[PDB]
Structure 1
Amino acid sequence: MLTVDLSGKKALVMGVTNQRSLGFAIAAKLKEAGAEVALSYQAERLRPEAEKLAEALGGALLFRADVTQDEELDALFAGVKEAFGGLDYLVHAIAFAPREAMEGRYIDTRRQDWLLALEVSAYSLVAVARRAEPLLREGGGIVTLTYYASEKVVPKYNVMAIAKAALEASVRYLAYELGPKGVRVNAISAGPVRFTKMYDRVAQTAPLRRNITQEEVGNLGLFLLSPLASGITGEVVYVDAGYHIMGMEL
């Protein structure tokens, strides 16, 4: 048997607002493997849900920070440093675009909505990576979540596609800049996890003839963060039941 033992390792998991988060899936696997987890939450009004998520994980530390606020990120990382002493893993599961941007056409995206989507969904990785850098230990890593709309047109994903392209390019640059410290940076491109017509359409065309599960994403994040992935950096790894390899729908 192979064992993955992450006892003594420290993870910060950002962007989790409910148990269906792919981020929650990864945090759950990290806990199961033995790591200690800190969860960020956006604002004090959301602390109750954050407390519920921490209890759902069997225990986690909470910190308040809005990723648009540089001081609040500074305070978060000061808190992490004091509580953990250092960091091994950062899970970035932050994704946001204004509802108005996601309705209608990409060409019609308003300036402030476009910039906020990019700020929250892409720049946030840079902002947290920079602050994590002095805390991250050798062998440590950052993982983010993406979707294949970065490369292929998925109508109505709109500015989020563009944010994901910016996020994936960021992963590559950050991998180059963090690599000398022995810190790796990767993205997981996930398929949908079970509206119903969309899930069924994906399932008919995917090679595996089904949708992926939350646990499948969790397992890939565990692997990438673990020492089993020590040679892998700068990569976008697809967990999508093979869907994106298809050149037409079935």
Structure 2
Amino acid sequence: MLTVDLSGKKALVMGVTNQRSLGFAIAAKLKEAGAEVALSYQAERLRPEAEKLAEALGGALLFRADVTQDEELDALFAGVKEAFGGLDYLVHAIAFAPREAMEGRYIDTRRQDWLLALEVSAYSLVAVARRAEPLLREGGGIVTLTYYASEKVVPKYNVMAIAKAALEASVRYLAYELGPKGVRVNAISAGPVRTVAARSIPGFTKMYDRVAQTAPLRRNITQEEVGNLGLFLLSPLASGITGEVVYVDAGYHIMGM
């Protein structure tokens, strides 16, 4: 029997909304492994759900932070230094595109919608990585979440496909710059899962149904399958792995037709 024991480790998970959140799936696994966890949530409307999540984890520190505001980000990381002293793990589970941009055609996307989508969904990784750098200890790491439409055309996913391409490229450049300090940076490419952010997408049930009928495992993945991969990548079992996009999608992405 092998064990993963993260007692003594300090983790920050950004982007929790409810118990179906993929960020919450990872936090739950890190907690279960023995890490001390903090969560950040977007806005005050979400605080009561976030309190429910800290309760479900059996205890978590909570912070509010909108990633479009640099001063809210400075406050988050000063708060982390005071509450933790330093940091081992950072999970980035944040994305957004305007509903107007996600129906219809990518070619028809308005300038300010496209810019907002890229700002929240890709630049936010660079912003949080810069601020985490002085805190992050040797052996520490950052993990983000992505999707296959960065590589191949999924109708209706539109500007989000382009933001995910920008995020994956940022993962590689950040792995190069943080590696000399012993810090790793990786991405998880998840298959469809029923979440707040996912079901708002107009394509969702159509692709959810397609995956189950075409993927090698003949089913969709679960949020727990994403949590286990995040746990592994952050843990010392993954100490030779940096700069990587790892797929947890029941093999859907390897299929043609």
> Normalised by the size of structure 1, how large is the TM-score?
0.97
Q: Which runs of 5+ in 1 are unaligned?
A: none
The equivalences for 1:220-239 within 5 A come to 220-239=229-248
2: CA distance between counterparts of 1:242 and 1:146? 15
The one-character-per-residue Cα deviations of 1:96-133 (angstroms, maximum 9, x if unpaired) are 00111101110011000000000000000000000000
Q: Which runs of 5+ in 2 are unaligned?
A: 195-203
In the TM superposition, what is the alpha-carbon distance from 1:235 to its structure 2 partner?
A: 0.2
2: CA distance between counterparts of 1:153 and 1:146? 14
Point out the more displaced range, 198-207 or 218-227. 198-207
3-state DSSP of counterpart to 2:153? coil
For the aligned residue pairs, the C-alpha RMSD in angstroms reads: 0.9
The one-character-per-residue Cα deviations of 1:66-120 (angstroms, maximum 9, x if unpaired) are 1011011000000000000001100000010011110111001100000000000
2: CA distance between counterparts of 1:60 and 1:109? 39
For these two proteins, the number of residue pairs brought into alignment is: 248
In the TM superposition, what is the alpha-carbon distance from 1:196 to its structure 2 partner?
A: 4.4
2: CA distance between counterparts of 1:218 and 1:64? 23
2: CA distance between counterparts of 1:121 and 1:21? 16
1: CA distance between counterparts of 2:193 and 2:6? 27
Residue of structure 1 equivalent to 2:200 = none
In the TM superposition, what is the alpha-carbon distance from 1:233 to its structure 2 partner?
A: 0.4
In the TM superposition, what is the alpha-carbon distance from 1:198 to its structure 2 partner?
A: 3.1
3-state DSSP of counterpart to 1:161? helix
Q: Flag the 1:193–1:43 CA change in 2: closer, same or farther, 3 A.
A: closer
1: CA distance between counterparts of 2:122 and 2:102? 16
2: CA distance between counterparts of 1:198 and 1:86? 41
3-state DSSP of counterpart to 1:145? strand
In the TM superposition, what is the alpha-carbon distance from 1:199 to its structure 2 partner?
A: 2.3
Residue of structure 2 equivalent to 1:43 = 43
The one-character-per-residue Cα deviations of 1:20-60 (angstroms, maximum 9, x if unpaired) are 11111000000000001111112223221211111121110
2: CA distance between counterparts of 1:11 and 1:145? 16
In the TM superposition, what is the alpha-carbon distance from 1:242 to its structure 2 partner?
A: 0.4
Q: Flag the 1:153–1:32 CA change in 2: closer, same or farther, 3 A.
A: same
1: CA distance between counterparts of 2:190 and 2:99? 22
2: CA distance between counterparts of 1:108 and 1:200? 27
- Runs of 4+ aligned structure 1 residues displaced above 6 Å come to none
In the TM superposition, what is the alpha-carbon distance from 1:197 to its structure 2 partner?
A: 4.4
2: CA distance between counterparts of 1:111 and 1:200? 32
> Normalised by the size of structure 2, how large is the TM-score?
0.95
Residue of structure 2 equivalent to 1:218 = 227
In the TM superposition, what is the alpha-carbon distance from 1:200 to its structure 2 partner?
A: 2.6
3-state DSSP of counterpart to 1:221? helix
2: CA distance between counterparts of 1:47 and 1:108? 35
2: CA distance between counterparts of 1:186 and 1:213? 20
